Write a protein that binds this ligand. Sequence first.
Ligand SMILES: [Zn+2]
Ligand SMILES: [Zn+2]
Ligand SMILES: [Zn+2]
Ligand SMILES: [Zn+2]
Ligand SMILES: [Zn+2]
Lengths: 109, 185, 265, 329, 263
Amino acid sequence: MKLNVDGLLVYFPYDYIYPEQFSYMRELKRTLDAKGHGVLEMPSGTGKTVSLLALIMAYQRAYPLEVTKLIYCSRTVPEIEKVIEELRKLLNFYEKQEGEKLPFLGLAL
Amino acid sequence: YMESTVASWYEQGILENIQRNKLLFIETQDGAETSVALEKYQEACENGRGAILLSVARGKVSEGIDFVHHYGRAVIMFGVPYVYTQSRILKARLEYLRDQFQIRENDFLTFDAMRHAAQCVGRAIRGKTDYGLMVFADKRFARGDKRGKLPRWIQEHLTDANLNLTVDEGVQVAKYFLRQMAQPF
Amino acid sequence: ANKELEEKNRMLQEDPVLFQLYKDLVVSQVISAEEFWANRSDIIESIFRTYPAVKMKYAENVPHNMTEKEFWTRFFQENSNAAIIKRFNHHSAMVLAAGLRKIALNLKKSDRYYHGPTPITSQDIINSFQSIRQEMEAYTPKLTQVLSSSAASSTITALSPGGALMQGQMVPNDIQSELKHLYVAVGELLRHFWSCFPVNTPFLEEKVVKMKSNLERFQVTKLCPFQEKIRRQYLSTNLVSHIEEMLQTAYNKLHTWQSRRLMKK
Amino acid sequence: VRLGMMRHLYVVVDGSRTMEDQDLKPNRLTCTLKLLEYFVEEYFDQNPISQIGIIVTKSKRAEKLTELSGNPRKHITSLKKAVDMTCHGEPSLYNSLSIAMQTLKHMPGHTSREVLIIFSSLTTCDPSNIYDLIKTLKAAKIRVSVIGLSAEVRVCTVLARETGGTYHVILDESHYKELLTHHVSPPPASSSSECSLIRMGFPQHTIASLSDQDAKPSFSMAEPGLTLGGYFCPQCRAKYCELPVECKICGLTLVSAPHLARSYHHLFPLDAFQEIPLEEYNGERFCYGCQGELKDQHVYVCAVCQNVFCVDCDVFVHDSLHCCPGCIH
Amino acid sequence: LNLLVIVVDANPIWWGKQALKESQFTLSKCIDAVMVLGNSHLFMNRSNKLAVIASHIQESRFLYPGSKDGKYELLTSANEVIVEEIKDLMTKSDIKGQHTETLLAGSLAKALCYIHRMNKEVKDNQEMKSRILVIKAAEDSALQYMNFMNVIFAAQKQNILIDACVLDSDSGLLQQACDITGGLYLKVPQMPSLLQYLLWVFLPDQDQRSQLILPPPVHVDYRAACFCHRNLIEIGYVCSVCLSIFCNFSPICTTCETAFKIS
Ligand SMILES: [Zn+2]
Ligand SMILES: [Zn+2]
Ligand SMILES: [Zn+2]
Ligand SMILES: [Zn+2]
Ligand SMILES: [Zn+2]
């Protein structure tokens, strides 16, 4: 599922995304393009993590110099474990799409 | 407040009827008892007995725990969550915010209540489109300010028709909504 | 343990038919009775399963110079505030613990269904077709042609009870119960006799019991005809021959299968 | 898709006091029993060879209201008697499923053993854990398809999906009718299911030979008076009042040809007819099925006969007749 | 009220054989008798209604959806419509030597769905007791057993009485059919006097049939046979898929191809 976002093309593992996901991605891309701190709210407990991670990875690929790395913080370790699971699934999907390993590292402290 | 309400229900026959209808579990300050009670609550939810977990909004259990499909199906909020108006730490924290950044004391207090309520009531919609209803047993939430400060996604679903339902009307509409959600897509 | 004796005492009078037939098999001394069986409050209970402490207290305080009413009285009897919450948590946990005590089908012949088990020149069709085409150039002859009085009278006479197409006793009452009882006895013993008869059972230990049952057939059918004789010599009316067919057919199956077994050997 | 024509089905009804709640227009238990009477009669009318059994569970104990039988009237009478049942206590899935398992364990392998638990009270107080019983159920290949009421019970969800059955919850009374009518039909046979030949016997109705000469008087076999004529058995030679019935001696099923023929339509399902609203060059005003003018913009057609059927004709054909009238030709 | 449906088996082959034989009975007289029966049925009451179906080897067609002789207008319309339509159908017909057996199952299916349509349209205030007065006139076809059994069971479920009036031949399938739904079975041996049989045995409706003496039902031989040589069998070995009555125990029934496991 490759989404032709206004800023660029962004990969996505799951089949379909709700319109609220489109709005989230476009607003997030606007904030990153402005390179200014901002705040936004999304209802779903899950799904926001995958959309955010996919958009950040695509933005990193497009403008690697713009963003050095992502620092994604969660309330509790049991919760951040689910985030690392989501990131692992996304990386597996992207690796299958590309056909080879890429210099991408992701870890939890 | 939870203990006082539980004691009153125990003195009356309501609590025994609730126990008959469904299992009842209560939260305590001690983490070990909290964990054991929640562990048994999960098994009760898996089984057909069901469970009614009484907890505190500020309780660490409320923030740590996440409710998913067939877990915390109906989230009940008994009273607007407000911290005691005697803890002097909040007095500094609040009057300083009034002096600097110009936030009204009542504004910040209601914000602290609404944010906490949204935190403790927003778990049922975790993911995978699992149905569930959030009932707030307090006429205060019906006030415009509370509704306005409520998160947009919940508020827009909320309507004036069901804004101030009586207990019986709320029960009937909850039954009907559960009927609608039971059937597949 | 005399479990068989206890069961016999339990069913001696609780169920009339079972003991009646079991006794009947011995009344004429047909066979040993061994083969017969060889071949074939709420609140206190809830507390008992709820509170293990109450169970231990009951065991230690079993009624001794006391009264169950007093024992009942003993039941109901911030420090107290937290005790209530703890008590509900523990009690619900105890209840929960007590409740958790340890091929796509394909076919090659479908017309067989179209013609199921129900069982079963060229110029003739042309001739019949043309003749029937020319038959009905005239219509509405109902005035006289459809029916005639003579034929109608013949039809009514036929419909009469003595006519064609229309061909046209509960005297004994007490004998009915005796016949029912005999039929029940026959059914009871035929059940075991036919239990493994249809199955070949080519095993020594399996065939022993069919041999014993086959001998039991002779032994029961020895006594059946005596009661038949008693009933027969009353009026010589309303013959009861259906019972004879069951016995004779069982004998025929027994002898035919014996011959087949000898042939197989 | 392989289908199990012969199935021994147990409709497990719960006498919980949750059944007391009048969620439906009449009392819940009364409505369930009244509709289950129709379900029983229709099940026998759509699967004569099959047989049914009712287990009523209340006060943590399960009692067999009626053993396995081939007579719908006896079960209907049991339902009518149970309508007045007190309806107090708590059900036990372990007890009910254990009773059903005990009765169904000795059933023949070829027949499909099935259980339909009409669950009303979400609670399940059982002496022993039911997850262990789930293993025995899977080993015994007893299909269990729960139908919950006003609750999506997790233990019953896992029961249904693990054992191969289906789980459902009642949206309303109309949907309850649909659920039970759907469960009436035989379920498809899965990989675990196995088929084997079953001995069958076909009796012939007999009467007095000639003017009550060499008659065969007999009363019945399960206050029956003397019968001049009736059905018989190839092996029992014992008079039977009604068919189909299992032999009381042989253990062989006695059943006539029409009863078997009643189930051929299951093997031969009717392909759905495409619904075209527009006339589509259909100049025949009269509907071929009913010879009536099409008063609605709807038409149905086969892929073989290519005939025209109205809404009522198509609905009736696919519902009851189970065969296309013109396409028979 | 009562909705009567006359399923006449007007087989051209057999009726034209009668015509060639020049026998006293003719299809014209049979149609006249059926017409008189329908007229009498409607004569019984205003609410009563009737319909007619004619059977042919190719298909089956409905014969029924001033007072020139001083006649009742409705019955006059019935007479005219049935006469014209039956003459048209008999006059126009293609020839197919391969198919000559009379078709009855399709006609009965049409009757059943027609009765269902009328029951839907009629007001719920009045209850309708439909009936099908089948009048066979030729031997049945073996290949039609399955579909005929389907329609018979549908009629049983829908509560319609199949009153068979076979003549010149005793169709075991048709007698079995009417026995299931409880409809009467009369075999008239006097074809010329057929109408008297209708005005007595068939004409009275189910309401009054019980409180009336009618010829006793004929014994029905519910025979079974194996799919090999077509002969009566008392013990059948059916499987769990085919549900087919067979000859003797076999490793695998041909119509199934299942992997039966011995034991
Ligand atoms: Zn038998
Ligand atoms: Zn139509
Ligand atoms: Zn068709
Ligand atoms: Zn054969
Ligand atoms: Zn087969």
